[PDB]
Design a protein around this ligand. Structure first.
Ligand SMILES: [Mg+2]
Ligand SMILES: [Mg+2]
Ligand SMILES: [Mg+2]
Ligand SMILES: [Mg+2]
Ligand SMILES: [Mg+2]
Ligand SMILES: [Mg+2]
Ligand SMILES: [Mg+2]
Ligand SMILES: [Mg+2]
Ligand SMILES: [Mg+2]
Ligand SMILES: [Mg+2]
Ligand SMILES: [Mg+2]
Ligand SMILES: [Mg+2]
Ligand SMILES: [Mg+2]
Ligand SMILES: [Mg+2]
Ligand SMILES: [Mg+2]
Ligand SMILES: [Mg+2]
Ligand SMILES: [Mg+2]
Ligand SMILES: [Mg+2]
Ligand SMILES: [Mg+2]
Ligand SMILES: [Mg+2]
Ligand SMILES: [Mg+2]
Ligand SMILES: [Mg+2]
Ligand SMILES: [Mg+2]
Ligand SMILES: [Mg+2]
Ligand SMILES: [Mg+2]
Ligand SMILES: [Mg+2]
Ligand SMILES: [Mg+2]
Ligand SMILES: [Mg+2]
Ligand SMILES: [Mg+2]
Ligand SMILES: [Mg+2]
Ligand SMILES: [Mg+2]
Ligand SMILES: [Mg+2]
Ligand SMILES: [Mg+2]
Ligand SMILES: [Mg+2]
Ligand SMILES: [Mg+2]
Ligand SMILES: [Mg+2]
Ligand SMILES: [Mg+2]
Ligand SMILES: [Mg+2]
Ligand SMILES: [Mg+2]
Ligand SMILES: [Mg+2]
Ligand SMILES: [Mg+2]
Ligand SMILES: [Mg+2]
Ligand SMILES: [Mg+2]
Ligand SMILES: [Mg+2]
Ligand SMILES: [Mg+2]
Ligand SMILES: [Mg+2]
Ligand SMILES: [Mg+2]
Ligand SMILES: [Mg+2]
Ligand SMILES: [Mg+2]
Ligand SMILES: [Mg+2]
Ligand SMILES: [Mg+2]
Ligand SMILES: [Mg+2]
Ligand SMILES: [Mg+2]
Ligand SMILES: [Mg+2]
Ligand SMILES: [Mg+2]
Ligand SMILES: [Mg+2]
Ligand SMILES: [Mg+2]
Ligand SMILES: [Mg+2]
Ligand SMILES: [Mg+2]
Ligand SMILES: [Mg+2]
Ligand SMILES: [Mg+2]
Ligand SMILES: [Mg+2]
Ligand SMILES: [Mg+2]
Ligand SMILES: [Mg+2]
Ligand SMILES: [Mg+2]
Ligand SMILES: [Mg+2]
Ligand SMILES: [Mg+2]
Ligand SMILES: [Mg+2]
Ligand SMILES: [Mg+2]
Ligand SMILES: [Mg+2]
Ligand SMILES: [Mg+2]
Ligand SMILES: [Mg+2]
Ligand SMILES: [Mg+2]
Ligand SMILES: [Mg+2]
Ligand SMILES: [Mg+2]
Ligand SMILES: [Mg+2]
Ligand SMILES: [Mg+2]
Ligand SMILES: [Mg+2]
Ligand SMILES: [Mg+2]
Ligand SMILES: [Mg+2]
Ligand SMILES: [Mg+2]
Ligand SMILES: [Mg+2]
Ligand SMILES: [Mg+2]
Ligand SMILES: [Mg+2]
Ligand SMILES: [Mg+2]
Ligand SMILES: [Mg+2]
Ligand SMILES: [Mg+2]
Ligand SMILES: [Mg+2]
Ligand SMILES: [Mg+2]
Ligand SMILES: [Mg+2]
Ligand SMILES: [Mg+2]
Ligand SMILES: [Mg+2]
Ligand SMILES: [Mg+2]
Ligand SMILES: [Mg+2]
Ligand SMILES: [Mg+2]
Ligand SMILES: [Mg+2]
Ligand SMILES: [Mg+2]
Ligand SMILES: [Mg+2]
Ligand SMILES: [Mg+2]
Ligand SMILES: [Mg+2]
Ligand SMILES: [Mg+2]
Ligand SMILES: [Mg+2]
Ligand SMILES: [Mg+2]
Ligand SMILES: [Mg+2]
Ligand SMILES: [Mg+2]
Ligand SMILES: [Mg+2]
Ligand SMILES: [Mg+2]
Ligand SMILES: [Mg+2]
Ligand SMILES: [Mg+2]
Ligand SMILES: [Mg+2]
Lengths: 117, 151, 137, 112, 52
RNA sequence: AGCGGCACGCGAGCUGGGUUCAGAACGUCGUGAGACAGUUCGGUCUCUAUCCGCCACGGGCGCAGGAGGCUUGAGGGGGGCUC
RNA sequence: ACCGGAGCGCUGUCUCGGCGAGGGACCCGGUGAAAUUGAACUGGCCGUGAAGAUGCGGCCUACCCGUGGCAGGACGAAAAGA
RNA sequence: UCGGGGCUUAAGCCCAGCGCCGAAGCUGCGGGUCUGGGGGAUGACCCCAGGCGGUAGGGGAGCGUUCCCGAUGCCGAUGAAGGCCGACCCGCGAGGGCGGCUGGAGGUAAGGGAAGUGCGAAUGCCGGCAUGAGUAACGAUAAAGAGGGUGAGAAUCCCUCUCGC
RNA sequence: GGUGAAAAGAACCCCGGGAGGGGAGUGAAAUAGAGCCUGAAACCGUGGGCUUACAAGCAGUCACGGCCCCGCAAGGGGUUGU
């Protein structure tokens, strides 16, 4: 009983060329160039999913510290204040309040100010 | 494989790969690697199991109710239509596969062509064929010889 | 899902120059070229205020920087390395010395280069009195 | 409507006939007849010849008017190549592909 | 062969790019005054002729 | 009438006298075949540059009306000798 | 037609190069290869790294695409180092 | 050129202090798998805790390919195998379904058996098509020019004259 | 090695020196049209969408934004500017 390659190999290749659509030049036409590209692609994403946490950990901090200093105080103090008062709210992201809903930020500012001193 | 032995090319400063003869399995057309040769597939199953199985098969088809001994083969005279008539009387409506065991050469000739029937000599009784069929039916002269092999 | 600003509006600004420590001042200017002070900060769009400096020909600087500090400049050719000292920068093109700093403090990419274009430095003042000009400090 | 014509297996490299085809894609029939008429390339002759046939079909098979048909589209595809050997210095031999072309012109009524 | 040789297959991109200046240009033509047809300027052509 | 670096700069630039294949000989060593930072005569150096770089020369587009002519010089380069 | 030294004659061997001829090179029309080729969106310096980097870091520089030329690099090609 | 910019009661060094930033570490929330303990008379399943980087290598559980029993069966012209497409469904995954198009005569469940059973590399073997590139070259530097003719087409075929070897 | 169940292998007209096509015709099917079943991939080409001429690259990934396309919708697909 001989089991020639048959369809098996084509389908496995074809299945990867899909995955690699849109890649530059040979990386999307050649199975071998494709697989190589996809290898790194998987790792790049996995590493970037951990990154995306930090990409915003930051963005928010700037944006916060930004509006934060309009009120005369700085982020590193603002957090000392909030954290001092036990105001565990405003998970950094929600301190988008600095943007829309400014008054509430101004509120949280005084609260943190009163807490610190 | 039918090729020569000559070393296809010198293997040095040729620049080509490196090879011996076309016969080598890396070449297409070359010889097969661990491809199959003819071999014996049989083995000697312990006799005591050849028995137990046979008995157990006949038993299974009895505990099931499907077994039926007979002798009143009036449908003698090797002619399918006759055995076909005897079949109905005996409740073998041809609804289920049957392993008809009998010493009778004619009754054999009769039932032979029915697609739902498996004629068979008494000595030929065996596990596979029993299990294949849905119902065992055999003449009493047969049930003596099966009872003889083991019983 | 985090906020994202719309088409902003170029806030302009007017900075002095006299007496300001070159680098110290240069920092503040940069942070203004980027948002970083505007709470709707967006690192891929550029919306930092336009900056306009004047009287740059008066910038302070500590140490002996006026003779010590020298600016290098490579041309493709052999020996093409030029060594121009601070003293000579101000003596000739003086707005130059303020640029070589802030530019060196902006990001590197294509956007960073756009930001540099949002900077206007003069020795004067007498800058082109377009519109906005809220002097700062 | 539209009427096509195709000359297959023309002994001439596609890369070379294509230049002449690009030269008349979408132009009028009268314009092309002139262009191909004074274009200095072996390919012109062929592209012209298929161009002419494309017209007769348009008229004698599809009613459309000569006074107002043009090259809606056109193109050349590569057909099977005649490979030949070629003795070379020191006994080595090269194969040389005398390539081939399928030339296609498709015409259409000017306006409506 | 001997000494220099390409270090890498040219990409279909770079290849076509090289060829950006290969395109032809239509022949310059003018309607001949005598006949109705077209001629290449400064030249005589069949189905026509010239004056003296 | 400087000394060094640049794969003791540079053989896809050249040469090939020297070294460093096969021939042959001298002195020398070895029974020998042979051997020698010992010597001597002879001895095939590969048309086609893809990319970077370099010398030149065009095509495209841009320069937020279109065009003809004249120009400023940021930034480079050349020169720099001596009796 | 062996290998070394010298001299006379004569010379583009040289100081030191110039001009000219023809056959190529170059442009147009016809036909149309090759070694090579992981894939390429393939710059400079100073570092750095398996100790000699277009691909890492910092900095400088650089509009997109070709054509005729040069051979410093791609530890260029060739030959699984003799 | 201290990574750069740039820094002088510092953005340097020394001593003291309060902050904040900062990993795939730790916490929060959800999920998987294994292991252990417990409820489950119960398989199923539920709960709690703990472990889960990995080359040589050991162990375990699966996926697909060819063929055999299951086949005098079953699916198939109201469309088999194969091919092309899919942003859908299931699986951790190898995979399996489903829908559309193509294709036009085969296919083979559940459950088992047997192997020529899975390829990206071997300067592998065979074939196909690329790159260099419209590039080098068109094979002796004895040499060509015109008129006339034939022909769908003529520098290249025929004739004449001139020239050269 | 393979048209199709069967040559029914395409009369006739049209462009062309021919080749090859366009109609007409046969056939269930002609993208079964004659090295003709199926017709994958590399490779070449035509049209359409998004995109690119101040830009630094193992060609991807993450995020946001613009354009084009699907669905009444929340949404999804393609592309790529930073
Ligand atoms: Mg195999
Ligand atoms: Mg033989
Ligand atoms: Mg032998
Ligand atoms: Mg043999
Ligand atoms: Mg060898
Ligand atoms: Mg064989
Ligand atoms: Mg039977
Ligand atoms: Mg100093
Ligand atoms: Mg970027
Ligand atoms: Mg980038
Ligand atoms: Mg001297
Ligand atoms: Mg020295
Ligand atoms: Mg030197
Ligand atoms: Mg060397
Ligand atoms: Mg040295
Ligand atoms: Mg040397
Ligand atoms: Mg040499
Ligand atoms: Mg040398
Ligand atoms: Mg060499
Ligand atoms: Mg010599
Ligand atoms: Mg010498
Ligand atoms: Mg010598
Ligand atoms: Mg020697
Ligand atoms: Mg040797
Ligand atoms: Mg010797
Ligand atoms: Mg010595
Ligand atoms: Mg010698
Ligand atoms: Mg030579
Ligand atoms: Mg390179
Ligand atoms: Mg270089
Ligand atoms: Mg100047
Ligand atoms: Mg100068
Ligand atoms: Mg100079
Ligand atoms: Mg000089
Ligand atoms: Mg002699
Ligand atoms: Mg002399
Ligand atoms: Mg003379
Ligand atoms: Mg000299
Ligand atoms: Mg000449
Ligand atoms: Mg030539
Ligand atoms: Mg010649
Ligand atoms: Mg040519
Ligand atoms: Mg470049
Ligand atoms: Mg150094
Ligand atoms: Mg490193
Ligand atoms: Mg490293
Ligand atoms: Mg490198
Ligand atoms: Mg890195
Ligand atoms: Mg670098
Ligand atoms: Mg540069
Ligand atoms: Mg050329
Ligand atoms: Mg050249
Ligand atoms: Mg070179
Ligand atoms: Mg050269
Ligand atoms: Mg070299
Ligand atoms: Mg070796
Ligand atoms: Mg520093
Ligand atoms: Mg202090
Ligand atoms: Mg358990
Ligand atoms: Mg139990
Ligand atoms: Mg762990
Ligand atoms: Mg593990
Ligand atoms: Mg082990
Ligand atoms: Mg299993
Ligand atoms: Mg059944
Ligand atoms: Mg049926
Ligand atoms: Mg039917
Ligand atoms: Mg149905
Ligand atoms: Mg169908
Ligand atoms: Mg099968
Ligand atoms: Mg479901
Ligand atoms: Mg269908
Ligand atoms: Mg199907
Ligand atoms: Mg099975
Ligand atoms: Mg090879
Ligand atoms: Mg090789
Ligand atoms: Mg190689
Ligand atoms: Mg190999
Ligand atoms: Mg081959
Ligand atoms: Mg091959
Ligand atoms: Mg040539
Ligand atoms: Mg030749
Ligand atoms: Mg030529
Ligand atoms: Mg010849
Ligand atoms: Mg004539
Ligand atoms: Mg005549
Ligand atoms: Mg004619
Ligand atoms: Mg003639
Ligand atoms: Mg004739
Ligand atoms: Mg036939
Ligand atoms: Mg026809
Ligand atoms: Mg003829
Ligand atoms: Mg015909
Ligand atoms: Mg038709
Ligand atoms: Mg019909
Ligand atoms: Mg159909
Ligand atoms: Mg039809
Ligand atoms: Mg089809
Ligand atoms: Mg068909
Ligand atoms: Mg054919
Ligand atoms: Mg074919
Ligand atoms: Mg068939
Ligand atoms: Mg295809
Ligand atoms: Mg296109
Ligand atoms: Mg656009
Ligand atoms: Mg870019
Ligand atoms: Mg960079
Ligand atoms: Mg649209
Ligand atoms: Mg909707
Ligand atoms: Mg992108």
């Amino acid at each position: 009983p001989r089991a020639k390659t048959g369809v098996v190999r084509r389908r496995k290749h074809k299945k990867i060329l899909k995955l690699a659509k849109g890649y530059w030049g040979l990386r999307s036409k050649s199975f071998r160039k494709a697989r190589e590209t996809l290898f790194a692609a998987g790792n790049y994403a996995y590493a970037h999913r951990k990154r995306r946490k930090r990409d915003f950990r930051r963005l928010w901090i700037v944006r916060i510290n930004a509006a934060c200093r309009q009120h005369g105080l700085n982020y590193s103090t603002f957090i000392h204040g909030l954290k001092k008062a036990g105001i565990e709210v405003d998970r950094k992201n929600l301190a988008d309040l600095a943007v829309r809903e400014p008054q509430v930020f101004a509120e949280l500012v005084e609260r943190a100010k009163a807490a610190q001193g | 494989v039918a090729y020569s032995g000559r070393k296809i090319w010198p293997q040095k400063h040729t620049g080509r790969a490196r090879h011996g003869d076309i016969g080598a399995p890396i070449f297409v057309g070359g010889g097969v690697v661990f491809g199959p040769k003819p071999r014996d597939y049989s083995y000697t199953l312990p006799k005591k199991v050849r028995k137990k199985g046979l008995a157990m098969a006949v038993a299974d088809r009895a505990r099931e109710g499907k077994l039926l001994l007979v002798e009143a083969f009036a449908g003698v005279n090797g002619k399918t239509k006759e055995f076909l008539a005897w079949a109905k009387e005996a409740g073998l409506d041809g609804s289920e596969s049957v392993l008809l065991v009998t010493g009778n050469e004619l009754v054999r000739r009769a039932a032979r062509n029915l697609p739902w029937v498996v004629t068979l000599a008494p000595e030929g009784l065996n596990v596979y064929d029993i299990v294949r069929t849905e119902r065992l039916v055999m003449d009493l002269d047969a049930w003596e010889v099966f009872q003889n092999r083991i019983g | 899902k985090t906020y994202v600003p719309k088409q902003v509006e170029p806030r302009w600004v007017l900075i002095d120059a006299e007496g300001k420590t070159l680098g110290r001042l240069a920092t503040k200017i940069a942070t203004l070229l980027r948002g970083k002070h505007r709470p709707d900060w967006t690192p891929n769009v550029a919306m930092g205020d336009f900056v306009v400096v004047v009287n740059a020909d008066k910038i302070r600087v500590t140490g002996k920087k006026l003779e010590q500090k020298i600016y290098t400049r490579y041309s493709g050719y052999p020996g093409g390395l030029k060594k121009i000292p601070l003293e000579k920068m101000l003596a000739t093109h003086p707005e130059r010395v303020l640029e070589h700093a802030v530019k060196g403090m902006l990001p590197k990419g294509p956007l960073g280069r756009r930001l540099f274009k949002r900077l206007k430095v003069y020795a004067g003042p007498d800058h082109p009195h377009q519109a906005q000009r809220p002097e700062k400090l | 409507m539209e009427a096509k014509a195709i000359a297959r297996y023309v002994r001439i490299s596609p890369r070379k006939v294509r230049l002449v085809v690009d030269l008349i894609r979408g132009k009028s029939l009268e314009e092309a007849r002139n262009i191909l008429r004074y274009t200095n390339k072996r390919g012109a002759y062929f592209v012209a010849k298929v161009l002419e046939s494309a017209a007769a079909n348009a008229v004698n098979n599809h009613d459309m008017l000569e006074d107002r048909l043009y090259v809606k589209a056109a193109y050349v595809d590569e057909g099977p190549a005649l490979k030949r050997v070629l003795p070379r210095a020191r006994g080595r031999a090269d194969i040389i592909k005398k390539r081939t072309s399928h030339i296609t012109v498709i015409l259409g009524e000017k306006h409506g | 062969a001997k000494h220099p040789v390409p270090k890498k297959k040219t990409s279909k991109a770079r290849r076509d790019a090289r060829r950006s200046h290969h395109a032809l240009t239509p022949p310059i033509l003018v309607p001949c005054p005598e006949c109705k047809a077209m001629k290449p300027p400064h030249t005589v052509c069949p189905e026509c002729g010239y004056y003296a």
